[PDB]
Amino acid sequence: MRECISIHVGQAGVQIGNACWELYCLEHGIQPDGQMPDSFNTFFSETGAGKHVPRAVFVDLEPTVIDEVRTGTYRQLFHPEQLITGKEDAANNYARGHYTIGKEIIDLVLDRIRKLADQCTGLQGFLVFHSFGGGTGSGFTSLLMERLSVDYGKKSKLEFSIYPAPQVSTAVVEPYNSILTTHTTLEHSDCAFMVDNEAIYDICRRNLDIERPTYTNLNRLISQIVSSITASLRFDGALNVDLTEFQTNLVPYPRIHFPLATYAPVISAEKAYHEQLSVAEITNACFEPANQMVKCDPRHGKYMACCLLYRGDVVPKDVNAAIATIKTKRSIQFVDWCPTGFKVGINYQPPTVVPGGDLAKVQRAVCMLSNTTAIAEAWARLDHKFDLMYAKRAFVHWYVGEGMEEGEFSEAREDMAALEKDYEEVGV
Amino acid sequence: MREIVHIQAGQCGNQIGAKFWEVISDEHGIDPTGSYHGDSDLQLERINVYYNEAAGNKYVPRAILVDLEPGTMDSVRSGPFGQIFRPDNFVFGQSGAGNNWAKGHYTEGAELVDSVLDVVRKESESCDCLQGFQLTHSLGGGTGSGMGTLLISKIREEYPDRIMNTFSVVPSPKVSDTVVEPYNATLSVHQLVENTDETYCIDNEALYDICFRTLKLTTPTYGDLNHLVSATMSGVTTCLRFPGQLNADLRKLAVNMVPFPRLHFFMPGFAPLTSRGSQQYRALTVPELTQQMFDAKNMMAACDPRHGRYLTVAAVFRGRMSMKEVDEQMLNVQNKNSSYFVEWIPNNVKTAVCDIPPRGLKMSATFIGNSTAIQELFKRISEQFTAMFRRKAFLHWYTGEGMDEMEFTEAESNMNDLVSEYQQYQ
Amino acid sequence: MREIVHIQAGQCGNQIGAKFWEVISDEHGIDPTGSYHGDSDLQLERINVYYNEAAGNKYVPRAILVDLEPGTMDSVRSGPFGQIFRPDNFVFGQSGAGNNWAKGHYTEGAELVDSVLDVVRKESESCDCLQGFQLTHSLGGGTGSGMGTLLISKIREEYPDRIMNTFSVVPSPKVSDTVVEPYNATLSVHQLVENTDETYCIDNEALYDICFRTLKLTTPTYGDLNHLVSATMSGVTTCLRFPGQLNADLRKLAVNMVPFPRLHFFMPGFAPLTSRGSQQYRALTVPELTQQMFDAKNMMAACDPRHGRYLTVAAVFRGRMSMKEVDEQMLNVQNKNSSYFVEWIPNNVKTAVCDIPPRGLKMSATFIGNSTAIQELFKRISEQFTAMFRRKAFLHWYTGEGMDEMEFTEAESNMNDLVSEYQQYQ
Amino acid sequence: SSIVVAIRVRPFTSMEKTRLVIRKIVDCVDDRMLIFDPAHGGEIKFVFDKLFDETSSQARVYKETTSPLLDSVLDGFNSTVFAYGATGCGKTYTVSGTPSQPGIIFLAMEELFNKITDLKDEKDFEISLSYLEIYNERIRDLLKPETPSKRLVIREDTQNHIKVANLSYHHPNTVEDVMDLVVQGNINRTTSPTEANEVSSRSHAVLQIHIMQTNKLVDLTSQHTFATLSIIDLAGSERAAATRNRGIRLHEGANINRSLLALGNCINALCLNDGSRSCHIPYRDSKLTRLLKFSLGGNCKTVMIVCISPSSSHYDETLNTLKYANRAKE
């Protein structure tokens, strides 16, 4: 039954994967060599007594990242036909990821995906991890998702993507890749997620009291988020929300692929002894911008949908009271056409935290999946940065030199405008 | 995979290259016999990029020495590199150009290049996945300029998809070594801008100021100039050789370095530049690194960035660092110095952080600035070129090689157009 | 079984042959007394092929020395071969041809050959299963050319089913030793092409370049020339003497060497050719062997393969090797250099791998190239022949032996036809 | 003065007729307006300077499009002909192609010769032809590629006179032989038989007519009339993969896309400059645009002739092709 296939396209996704599978190991009790001392079948498959290995495909054109895995803790976990390497880098270039180089690795990748699919009995869907900045993260993701649609049709495909920060950027042509990729996401993704490194960095600095934030602990937060999302299938609690069920509640109109995944409560392992983290208290926190994982301000938009995935020692009764409280908060504005836009999941499986980070282990947590129209603002910022460079065709020769057509940028940009317009319409 | 073929064109290129290969060998724990005596895995993880592991586990630099003056080979070979560099890599003629670009390009260099390319091809076949070429030389003339130019053109033709990366010593504005620097530089640069993908502007005069004033040294030698240059070269491909917390590597970097094919002449810098005494009053933090890294006084080219505009700055870090710490400094700098950056380029500074610091340092950072201020280099050289060319001074040294005033006129014209392009982007 | 009768015709043949027999004896652990002091089984497994085990377990080379100048015998016999070669194998007259093919063929050689063939027949009866004959000599004239030619014709007549394999020194294009090389070579070659099955073109000039430039030697001696030749000879019958992972041996090889009866003149080469110093920058892998093996500069004949087309290349390897490693290199080479191979011959390179490397080497490879570029040898010699013959220069030295201009004209004509055939197949 | 954008649609063939019952992606509604959509964003409207279609003869297209440019050549300044399309849309075809078809090259020469006969009493016509080929960022002699590609001084005089290397120049005396030189150039021109567009113009080409007229009358000035006419062919454009492009095949696609990128950038800059008070166009960015230093944006008039493929199989290609042409003007 219910099984997942994870695909780690970007190294962001790989490092997230490292955190995720590290977490999954702890949560299911599985060792780095696959040794166990059940529902783990959703993520791991037995390959002989006491040899449970992860149902995932890692795709890199740049073995360095894979080699980190092959020389890291879970080299004894992942096998050689999961850890797929290529030859030439995608040079942060959608054209190379989707075409020039990626076209020569996609065939291998798909064959390994098909293998895992053949090994599945109840494939729920695919968990794709990547960025909107990298070449493979962008272009290859685009290539792959197209191919996945061909192979698996309506089988659910999630895109857990790293969303370019409004200030904390790393590269210069991030807008180029982001715009081209998001077009494909809208075409092929069944539900897409966005993570802002900048937002989390401030969350770490403030809520976790972190003097020096980085990807290690940032990813651990992401793994808590994703674990909470998938907790409903891998663990049997009270209200187990399926991926189809997530779509049912989080999609009122086909194109709405935003749901911001807000994890609460981001408490440091110190103040936790003073934090009275009740169901209501945590809920109050999760509906604030204080814990939002994308830089924005939801109070200037409207909530189309809001799913709250509670986890651990959570009581429906207390949840209902907490929800009613939230419902009276005028700071939370739902769309007029969805008076019932609330979804509750409750999973009896205490939040699990992996040693090697802060994120105090708590008895209660909630992942809010928020479809708020304000996200169009973030999209506008991205589009603007794109326009600034695009107006001068800056760096365009790096894409055109890979055979990229100018219209690919123009058309993708137009689709991105339509995306915002869709968020404008549902706000009415 | 991702092997790099290094070429040392000319005595300058050979001396700098030797220092470079000293640095790399030191970083990777390789002694002068080729034997590896390190202690990590990462030292060998990408050793293939720069070395061929010969029988006996002897790591031989994938480097070719190109020259027209015998004894130049020995100026390297007589040192540790008598056991490091391969005899087949010492490829040279028996003439010399005498600081004459044409002699080292059209005639004497053209006689040599056949045997150089043969060795190049050997290494090309020896490589499992060639990432590109790396040439070190000078614009002073002769081999480095002429032969360097020739090799770039020939190799580019053979490998149009693997464009050569160039580290070249440019003409100083005050500290001149010869008279016809404007000729040799102008002729070479005319060709370089058409063939190279990225050129590092290395100015001895600026380096002299760094050594003397920033590093508080007495009498800056060539070895001290090369120390700074080789530090840069190591930084440029640190993320190639070693792992970090993210990673856009070499070509992935290149895509974000320039928004145009021609304006690919960068100024290099190195953050941690200080005297041993003054280190005791400094703190090991990225904020200190960035204050030094973005200091125009520590630029290795004699052009003041602030006179122009930044198309982009690459900031390549080495050592365990916080991404927040680094990126916040980046943001603070771009915001505070926003007046020096190009308005319509959202992000004007690129972040890359490798977790492996330089030997002897706890941390460092490499500055690669794409600023239009470099136009001053090209403008001044063109002016000096005009000063001589207008009188046909020394002209006969090149017309004897089959050159004509038209070629010179075109080379000058082209450099002027290059300056104009910088002014336009400024 | 599969015994080979070796003949050393002329001083060149005797000196090369001596070196050959030194090499073989060394490889098989046989000292100069004939005593075997090896350590394997394979050293004796096929020792019968080259040696007769005389009473006392003394292995005597199945080799016959043929000569017209006493003292030539002693130039070999006075060395280790005074205890190795049999006295009955030192078969010689007391005249000398004076670099005159006719004297060593029609007259003086014809007087000797009766007693040579008698010794040949003795060895023929001594053999249990004669595989064929092997002749070493030269095209310089006299014994090697004339007597060598005579022996080939006479022996071929006796053993039409056991055609003699020939290693012959050809005329150099610059490094000439005498004046009438065109006469003696032309006359001999005219006969050789009609009688021999496989001829190795050994050019001292090309070998001089190998010794001096490839091996980085000072003053290439005849012993160094013979080192290269004897290395080839050993390689040719390594798969005969020793086991491998497959095996097409000598005649099995021959079937795949030429697609025609006449065009059987091959260029020999040897992969592992390098100075002791430069070895330290080289790797022990077949990819290194093939890069050296397919290098036209390392050909032992003074003709550049690339000027013509390959009918086939035999690549005979020695030492423990991967069949995939070897064959992939073969495929890569034929594909990359496809422009130099004959279009309508599917496989233009033959693989043979014996598991027994040369003494002193971990691995090696022998190049035997069937290329039409060898036509340059024959063409140039014919031109030089014309230059002399057109004036009847030195003609009287042969008409005194009963020869006529018709014979000379025919010999020239035939060589020209041979060149044309190479041009046709090119 | 300003760049004229003219666009013509190639008719349907058996490659579409055997497909029929399929929809035309191009809806031309008048001489300037095109509509291009089946609904993805709704009807896409374009306005151009002059439109043609499958019902308008190429002979008349010439008469309205480049026949005035031939006149422009001799109005005290030179003039040239540009084009655009997505490999296989018509660029090469429209020069004439079929022997019974008059097109750009055929009629330019034919009309000129008629004018030469009439105007021979006013000025002499010393004319020479140059055949340039642009391939992998290399400029070769299209007619005779045997000439070392290094031999080309891509430079202009201070009078904007063409000052290049000793190319295989040829005088014209008829139309057929001149077109035969164009064809022989195309024979020696690099193509790729492996591509769908049988004999695609993989390398670009410049057919440069060097007109050196002299005054038949004697006067104080006694100055000659030099002017030129360039007919330019391109490799069109293809997708980044373009269906499993391999090695040099991909590299070629990149190079022609780079060439057209630089060309397009220079055109865009030029049209933006056509209104401003500067003209900083980096012609150096490509040997093609270096050759076109004055052809594009010097003292001349020109036209952008776009070839359109209405086939349903080339929707996105033509979509961008039309938007491209629009961008070229805007």
Ligand SMILES: Nc1nc2c(ncn2[C@@H]2O[C@H](COP(=O)(O)CP(=O)(O)OP(=O)(O)O)[C@@H](O)[C@H]2O)c(=O)[nH]1
């Ligand atoms: N930054 C450095 N500059 C150097 C170094 N060695 C020389 N140079 C500079 O380069 C110029 C001298 O150049 P070269 O010896 O390389 C001339 P080359 O041998 O290439 O040709 P010839 O004319 O045949 O000697 C001059 O400006 C020197 O001051 C060095 O180690 N570092």
Ligand SMILES: Nc1nc2c(ncn2[C@@H]2O[C@H](COP(=O)(O)CP(=O)(O)OP(=O)(O)O)[C@@H](O)[C@H]2O)c(=O)[nH]1
């Ligand atoms: N490659 C080698 N070439 C040799 C060697 N010895 C001689 N030669 C070459 O062969 C030619 C001399 O040949 P020979 O002494 O064999 C003539 P031969 O004794 O056969 O008849 P005569 O005229 O009666 O001396 C000449 O080109 C020498 O330079 C050798 O050991 N190796």
Ligand SMILES: Nc1nc2c(ncn2[C@@H]2O[C@H](COP(=O)(O)OP(=O)(O)OP(=O)(O)O)[C@@H](O)[C@H]2O)c(=O)[nH]1
């Ligand atoms: N949140 C988070 N972001 C990351 C991490 N690693 C990289 N990133 C972000 O991902 C983007 C860079 O993309 P990568 O995933 O490194 O590139 P890639 O997918 O490997 O693509 P190529 O390397 O170009 O083939 C930047 O926006 C980085 O800030 C991580 O561990 N966590």
Ligand SMILES: Nc1ncnc2c1ncn2[C@@H]1O[C@H](COP(=O)(O)OP(=O)(O)NP(=O)(O)O)[C@@H](O)[C@H]1O
């Ligand atoms: N208007 C037309 N009528 C009939 N046939 C046409 C027409 N236009 C193009 N063709 C045909 O389509 C094939 C031509 O493609 P053309 O040669 O038109 O492609 P192209 O634009 O030069 N391709 P490319 O060189 O790659 O940019 C030719 O053989 C023409 O006959």
Ligand SMILES: [Mg+2]
């Ligand atoms: Mg990556």
Ligand SMILES: [Mg+2]
């Ligand atoms: Mg020198």
Ligand SMILES: [Mg+2]
């Ligand atoms: Mg003799």
Ligand SMILES: [Mg+2]
């Ligand atoms: Mg065409």
